[PDB]
């Protein structure tokens, strides 16, 4: 699976979104 991989030529190397709940993503910047 290339979903978790580096990418085609390594283009998605910096794309490492954090794994977090919906509250952790929403609440800090709700307002």
């Amino acid at each position: 699976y290339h979903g978790g991989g580096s990418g085609f030529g390594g283009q998605l190397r910096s794309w490492n979104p954090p794994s977090e709940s919906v509250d952790a993503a929403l609440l800090p910047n709700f307002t």
Partner: protein, 65 residues
């Protein structure tokens, strides 16, 4: 190589203005041909590439998100 130092010195002399085109003294007279700056720069570049004493050129770039 000893050609590279001479080429660098010739380039510096040409830039500063100490390259001699014609020298004369009474009857004696000698005239030397002149070359363009770009050809000398290309000569120095290829000569330094051949020597390999440093590395100034690299491969093409790459992109990522």
């Amino acid at each position: 190589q000893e050609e590279l130092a001479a080429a660098r010195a010739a380039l510096h002399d040409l830039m500063t203005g100490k390259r001699v085109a014609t020298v004369q003294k009474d009857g004696r007279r000698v005239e030397f041909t002149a070359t363009s700056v770009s050809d000398l720069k290309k000569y120095i570049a290829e000569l330094e590439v051949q020597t390999g004493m440093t590395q100034r050129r690299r491969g093409p770039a790459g992109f990522y998100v």
